[PDB]
Amino acid sequence: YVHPTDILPSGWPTATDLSGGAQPRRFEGTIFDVMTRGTIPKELHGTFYRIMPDYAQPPTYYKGGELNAPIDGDGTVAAFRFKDGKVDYRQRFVETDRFKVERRARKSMYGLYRNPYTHHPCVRQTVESTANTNVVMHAGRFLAMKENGNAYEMDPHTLKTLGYNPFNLPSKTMTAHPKQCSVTGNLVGFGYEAKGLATKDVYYFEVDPSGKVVRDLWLEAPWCAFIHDCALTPNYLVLMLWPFEANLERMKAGGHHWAYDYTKPITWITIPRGAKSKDEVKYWHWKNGMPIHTASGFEDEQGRIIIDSSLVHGNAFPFFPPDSDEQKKKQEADGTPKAQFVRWTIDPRKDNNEQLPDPEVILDTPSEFPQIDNRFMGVEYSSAFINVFVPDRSDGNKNVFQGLNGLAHYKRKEGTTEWYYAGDNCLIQEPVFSPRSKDAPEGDGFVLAIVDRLDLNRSEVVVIDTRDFTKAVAAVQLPFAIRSGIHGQWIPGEVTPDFETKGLVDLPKEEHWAPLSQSPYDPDA
Ligand SMILES: [Fe+2]
């Protein structure tokens, strides 16, 4: 049986998200008092903000959208606010300059990921960011980020877009993976391609809790590399270079911004915090592979930089293949690479020209989207909350972003790993952590994540108490599915302006519309 209306043509190209799912959602609005199952912990007082790529218009401008990437689509923020056991939800697109152009024209006007030579001529000199990868609340300001532009600011309650580049960074870009230092409170980050397309320039900065840039430095990467993420330590910001290179000639010819290169080693740039000269920066190298995200970093008792990350032993973004014929044939032959969670040691006393030691395998399972207890951000940390392919219950042949059906709570100090299974016919997305109280022990509290109930065409938020990581205490049940996203963050109400007085949904007025005389009821009858 085929439903006759299902053979009527659609004008939509296949617009995937990182999970591989391709259903456009695109709604903007609210649900007040979202249905829950179980008991919402009274200790949750804040908002889980998650951001997702969800092209608002069918992305047909270049090559009919055939080469759209899962990381391309217009950023939309979902907010789930927990207060006193009750949850509200709001979904809204970021009003990026790109989104505004395309909605006003009711037309796709942009081409390939990060390639202005494939956008419509009238928009080539716009900010092309879709602000779709991560969010942060810093200095009272709520930001949507994507690494090919500065951030867009949004109201944290209505999600209305307020402006661009709120911290007035001088670079053309800001990472979507800045880190909020637990010691200083600074937002510590960088922007690469910081002087425009295919530039090697990197701008490092720290923005203090009042919104002021208090430390910065201009430097360069060894090649124009895809510097997605970083790790913060007490004395360093360490940039993590993936083995992709940008080529302006390729982009002018209409090809992809990035191409994977098997000959590039994973490379790290150490930036001493508050450095005064680019001469203080050092480049360190291992071997080829793709460490997608850091959990965090710290310095050990001997001052050595320790960083945990995912590690895919090959290209986890196969939609940006190599440039050369020989390397393309290797990618196709290899298919899905081995994927693990690992630990790197960079000893600053060593000669940085010597190859780094091989990383230690921490989890021998495909692992991605790690987060930590941010009370330990930029210092020694132990807990990591990791999105995993659950051992013996997962499909190792899926790309790392497409088979994530569990969570792990890894504790370095104890050496233990606990496991949460999302369920049969379920995926689960990146976890976030909220401490049980401000002075709870590290990693004691609640873990939240979005679950795709694939057989039900719905999405839910699960809530897990770390005292039993294997069991959900509550589920927030939406009446529909949302896109599978990239990152999200738990943002405590304490740091959210006006959290005490403003909900995600504004209340209707108190006064009745109708006069007293219209009631059916008479107290005398
Ligand atoms: Fe990321």
Residue numbers in the entry: 24 to 548
The study reports:
Herein, Moesziomyces aphidis DSM 70725 aromatic dioxygenase (MapADO) is characterized through X-ray crystallography, biophysical as well as biochemical assays, substrate docking and mutagenesis. MapADO features a seven-bladed β-propeller fold and a Fe2+ center coordinated by four histidine residues and shares a conserved structural motif with homologous enzymes despite low sequence identity (<38%). Similar proteins were termed aromatic dioxygenase (ADO), , apocarotenoid or alkene cleaving oxygenase (ACO). These enzymes primarily act on aromatic compounds with a hydroxy group in 4-position and use a mononuclear Fe2+ iron that is embraced by four histidines. O2 is activated by this nonheme iron and reacts with the C–C double bond of a substrate, eventually leading to C–C bond scission and two carbonyl species as the reaction products.
